[model samples]
Target: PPVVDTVHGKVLGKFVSLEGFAQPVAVFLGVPFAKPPLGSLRFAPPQPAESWSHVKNTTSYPPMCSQDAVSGHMLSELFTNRKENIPLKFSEDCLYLNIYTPADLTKRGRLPVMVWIHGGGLMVGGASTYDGLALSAHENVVVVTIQYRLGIWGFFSTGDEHSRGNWGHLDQVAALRWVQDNIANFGGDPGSVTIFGESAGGQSVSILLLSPLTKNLFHRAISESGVALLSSLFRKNTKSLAEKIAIEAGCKTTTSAVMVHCLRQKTEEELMEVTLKMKFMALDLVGDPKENTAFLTTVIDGVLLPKAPAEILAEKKYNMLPYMVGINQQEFKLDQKTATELLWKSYPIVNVSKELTPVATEKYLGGTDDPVKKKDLFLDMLADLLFGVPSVNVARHHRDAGAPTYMYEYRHGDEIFSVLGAPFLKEGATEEEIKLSKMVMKYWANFARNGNPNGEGLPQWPAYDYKEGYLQIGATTQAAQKLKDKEVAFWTELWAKEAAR
Candidate 1:
């Protein structure tokens, strides 16, 4: 066992030696940064964890945040095509973080820290899935993967004084704060923390940049496949949504004041039951919801987020830090159901792009073979609407703010979907994947150390400019321009027409 002292107390962790790394990596798992949100703390801002005197054992992961069990099962089948049993139990006390660092911790704090927030549409996922050994040892940086509240337990909020939403966001902020105060004990430079994540977690990294609460906590950010500018992340009227959930949970009262109170008294099982019954499946097309549905997510609480992301971005009120936002080669290929039922209709500014669908297909894809072109149109729409354009939007604003910003399009081997974890850690990864991983880790490590992602020997990745300059990390790594310009131009022009209407 490995022992490291933190601000709260001593944590007894385990050690593992990788194939190439000479130094053993110390892993501290299931360390609580905040008190378990039980009893009155449910649906409320995270409370600081009380100090511990004993050497707490932190060698195993805690249970993931409670989510829909049935949906979790369906997700297992849909993605993996097999019944992948989730080993860890689901619990409300899932606000723990895992840390990985080089074995020796006695040196003057110098290693950069990369904190990973896992992405499951902000609904499902635990820190246990991300292994930090490969990243921490190879990059000589500390790796911290964290688990925040999820689904109803994590995001239920009243529109007003009863309860403000974003309990999950608050939980992440607490973990970052803990790193600032305690990461040095693990041979980490608290001053050089870089936050990164995919999808919901990616949105979280960008959201942390926007939130006033996370100010001065992290210095660099990487949002993979999701950014705050995507109009679908936040909900405006969360109180009514919460009231409906409370009704389903059998905790309803006349007023939200009493309803929230009743909710706190309910068991985790009861709340999870409502999560399953309200089966609003967005697994194919996640988070880009046009309907005012009751999905627990970020809200404008006048505190964490004073307003929506667009307002913050347009007003230039966000934290001006170095940012890198990009997407995998193919982020969720368009199935018939997701394409026909949910794709473009979710963007209300351009309501039901029925007429524009043909126009987009004819313009960007092709005019002939309506069957193939139609799917191609949906695929392009997925890239821009969900991943591509929203990413460039963030980089564009950050660059305009005169900050160091880099945009990328990851077209490596396969999709490199993060549900299993980083491709760099995969066992059967090809030599090609290894080469690409080397490039990516070097760039990320360089970016983490300084504000720039460029380094010697590696291909030059220029800071983004009006030319839409971006790095395309595909079979070969090189800087490219105007990625998906024709496809994205369709949406940009479409939205312009809608906005002017």
Candidate 2:
């Protein structure tokens, strides 16, 4: 294989062949998109990686950003006592990215680029969790995966330049800038880039949609099973939280600069331990009412995020682009049920939490009568309230503003839980379910290629409008009118009423 030259330097990647694909895929792993954020660079925005004179061997996976060793989450049960003992490593010098492209870049005129941001509630997870070969070769698009700062190191803030958070987001922006500058070498069209993600990654894409700093970095956006509407996404008590963290780390100082200096001097391991100890629980898990949940979230800094996402969405202040948003049919049932039970005992936590319940319970679940059924309804209600409805609202808001918006509900896939770290699919997917997954990939790929998801040899997906409603994606894919209309309207009215208060 010949080496390809990038603006930073020349690099060598490996060739991989998939069973069903016609051509090999070129995979470049652990390529530096930004300089390593170490020492003084820590707690600051991303700086560009230095240009190299030598041909770098972009073959092996790099270290991931420092996070707690993978355990104690929803997926821990599935991963424990498994046959494959995956070796997961972490380090501070983790500011790198991976790219997958067709083997022959010369033959392909610039293809659309899809950059994936993996999701683990913004606490844990890395680019290595996903492989892009299949999506790249099958869709004939350039796929790029990026790694960013995680946990306290990634989002620690004193609400000032001393330790301006969103280092992780900054890393992502730097990666996109890298793509814009050098993706041409890999046969990717910088102008046609699509940013997509799930869970926290999806929330990131949502925030980027509102960020002026990310203006024109990507042309299209896709959010799956996550949105930035959660009350936990923005931490208001920056100084208090920072002081608490400092006390835990033995940095007893009220001054922001001195406290930050003391905290920074601590080892990464020490910082990780102190940060974890001070936190009550992960946002994905259920927390006691008396204790606050873990607060590793993007803050509304004046520079990166000028206003709250709700404020931005209501005022139509975001950078509008072609948008696709959807949620799994039984999204919360798969992993959230256990956590909800543990938190609220008989009722779903979403119905009881002050921050969440006010907007949810009565409005969305008022119609149900049976306790058991209402409990089940609450689970489904939490799905829409937390993820589905917010996503739909985003699409509706954008579509109402005249930007192309598409929406769907994933009802067919039973094996969607595999990403939670099962050995194999929970159960083999039905033929119809398999077809739906393929259809989704095709729709996503087609949308990346052109602004429209409709293309030759695929089902006709009507452009979303107030009248057309959303496309119901299940065993049979079709544009169903008024997809979750009642629930959507309930929340919409509730939001309007509350916003006025």
Candidate 3:
């Protein structure tokens, strides 16, 4: 047991006795970032922690945020081994975070710090899931993994009477502020901080990049499989649908004020029951809102998040920081596989999907009559819409914002990720696919080392230009030319139309 003294109190945690990256490493698991958001603080943004005395035990990881199994769909399958349909099996007292650093700060260098935001659809995930040891050992960087509110606890709006929304984002900002103040004690360079995330975590990262309070905390940024623009949160149709869900959850009263009070009084299970019935809740737009409920997303309430990230990117209003960004070949496979029956029962899907009939689904899926083909096409289209295309569009927006941007698409041919028992290439089966995956890792690790994603022994990864249209597709040694011109035009037009709508 290692004991460290802090101004506020004495904290204790077990250090990993590994034999690599010769730096004194200390790991603090399940440390409080703020008072657990359990009682009255449930919807409030996370606050700083309370002072403590005798050695505080941080040896073990805490349970994740309150979430059902399918409810736990916000994160990827790799992080957990939990079964579905169980009582949250976790805790609402799960607002803790984890820290990994060299055992001795004096001997270790003041390393670059990388704070990872876990990618569970803003509904379910925990800091305990990601292994920061591998990264910290390889780079000699201090890593911090955070656990914030999820599901109804994270984002619920009875139309401003309750919250403007984005309490989860606010909690992230608060954690970074904590790192800026405390990471130095762990041998982390606050000035060289990098906050990165993947999937919905990526989306959260993107928001932080655009958040005014989060600006200047980190010198660089990375968003893996993230979307800066969303059709639901900003557009009225979707926002209204989400609002209606709140209404049905007893959040809709004669006045917004009364609704807000009513919702705040509702229990976690009760709230999940009502919102689970909103239209289109099970689809891409809402994501898996714990239990069967639908929490489509954080609305752009003018406070914590003043504007939509895409709008800021489009206006080129964001800080100019170097960024390493990309998406996996198969990014949207998790909840998209749920059956139509399970899907409709859970979210705003009934109405949203009614507008897009089976005929439209088939047509969009290349007019395939086969249900399997339709499912495949639907998955692919949804993946691109939710993650793939958004990533490319974000890269383009960053370039337009006069910021340096490097883009890649992960194309790994894996037995782990392949099709049903046989061979199903999600992003198409090609040799170029295998090459691209290596390039992505190489470029990413290189980027972490230096601010640039290019280096020796690797092919030239051209700096992104608004014109010429070139990107590094994972699976290749050489930086490959891509269909950027048409893609950019399509995204530019698409965003322009979305912004208009």
Candidate 4:
């Protein structure tokens, strides 16, 4: 272990040996890539981390950004059953990144870097607790996990100059820039950087490809289980959302600038109160809140997103890179009754005709009267609509733009998400589970290592095309074609008929 000098400062890191892994990894935690977003910097773009005079000790994890306990995800309970102390030392100054690199840097000039952005709909997840040590040692790559402002702190846009949202997005880009500038100090090849993320982070990865702002910041990309095309991600009506929050917080709304200043004056508790009270909890694509559920969304701030993302891809303006995108086997399910109610209320809001519903339902359920069966079918439809279709669409965009693109369908365990560190392989994990975990870590790191993930004894993951083939990472771990083609085609057509109308 040694002290590394970054563009901002010098930091000492420790090497930790993990069980079942031969080589230890140099671990650096809570390294700031950007200056904190506090006081007047709240809801503003991230500034660069200031230079440090002393050798900073980055041995412990940093504070997370301020957010509500739940952040109102429909699938919040699915994250964990362990009752946490919650609110793990949140602060406005919560811009940090953790680095994990293979300790045997004496052999290689530098290892390829894998940057991780976590999910929680961009409202709840932090950079901590996602141990990249095992991945770095197992795959011989550098792993960087980052945290940015979230919820109101990240995206309270007035849709204009007063407070342009996407602070979180800027935070991510800043971190990537930090990698380009500083990763060499930690034995990471900045040229081979790959940005991969899940949920909202996944959506962020997809959106990043479309932005001119990310020019040359990263070489390859991966989106796990979410994409920019997920209809729930973007919010054009962010000005109104800002207005509502300001009024609810009792801040003056005289002008956009005045309102934002008043918003800046509000306390963290006040901001979270207004934000969570109106949080959207619906699992459906329709943005309309159905009762207690509210929502979160990023806006078109002209800088991060110059125009419609579809148009950006249509014009081939997005970054032409090797992009790997995919989905998990599970989406958070609404119970039979809740799923049933959403069927009637959500479809109509999006103007799917009364006639269109049954036709689509028949296409999926096929006249099945079993409530449990219907529940699964509806949830699958929702999953396909939000994640499945969008992920494929992103792959299609990359493919058409002449980018080397690959796709996967993560079908390993019954569980919804993958864990790291101590939970990577739980105490009683099955052999199959252990094997599956290795395959995923291998595949992801392989992609980060090179543009392709096909080498290393793993099944060949073909480049996705109009035929829509993907690597199904399951018990079989083989190539499969036309994932839910008929059902996805039906829903895509539904959007054309009703939404286009």
Residue 356 of candidate 2: its Cα lDDT?
Answer: 42
Which candidate's lDDT is highest?
Answer: 1
Q: Could you arrange the candidates by lDDT from highest to lowest?
A: 1, 4, 2, 3
Write down the worst ten-residue block by lDDT for model 3. 415-424
Candidate 4 local lDDT, residue 230: 72
Give the poorly placed runs of model 3, Cα more than 4 Å off.
Answer: 5-7, 19-24, 70-77, 80-89, 232-252, 272-281, 284-293, 332-378, 412-442, 457-459, 467-476, 483-501
Predicted candidate 2 versus true structure: per-residue lDDT over 309-375, tens digit per residue: 7778888867888888767756532223333443343222233444444335444344345344345
For model 4, the stretches where C-alpha displacement exceeds 4 angstroms are: 70-87, 105-108, 281-293, 333-340, 344-359, 369-374, 412-425, 499-501
Clashing pairs in 2: none
The TM-score of candidate 3 is 0.77
Q: What is the lDDT of residue 61 in candidate 2?
A: 78
**Global lDDT scores for all candidate models:** 0.76, 0.71, 0.60, 0.74
lDDT of 4 by residue, 1-501 (tens): 667889988998888886677777889988999987878988889988889899999987788787765552222334431222223566777899999888465544478999988787777767764667667776788989988788878878888888888898989989999999989888899889999888888889888888889998999998888888776677665766677778888987788999989988888888877866665443445554333123556678899898867778789867899899888757643344445546556642233345565665565544566555445777676577668877787778788888988988877113223423223423545667666667777778778888888786898888787787788877778998876677567777776777656
lDDT score, candidate 2, position 352: 45
Between candidates 1 and 3, the TM-score winner? 1
lDDT at residue 56 of model 4 (Cα atoms): 96
lDDT of 3 by residue, 1-501 (tens): 666555456668766754434544588887776777765676677776788867899877767776655546434344421222112246767767788886365454577778888776666667765656645654467778887776667776544635566777777887888778777777787888877777667777777787777777787777876655544333221245445655677566566556556666778777566645543224553444233334456666666556666577777776688876666656432222343333333233222233233332444343344455346655454455566666777777787777878775555113112101011112334555434433444455466657677767677777767442445453343455443344345445644654645
Tell me the tens digit of each residue's lDDT in model 1 across 1-501.
778888888999988887677888888989999999999999798999999999999988777788865555444333331123446678999989999898486567579999988777677877765666777777788989888998877778877768888889989999999999999888898889999887788899988998888888999998888888655566665776787788898876588788889999989888777887776444324545345364577888888888888778887767888999887756553335444555455544223455455455445444444564356655655557666777877777788888788888886113223222245444445677666666777788788899788888899887888787889886788898876667566677776786766
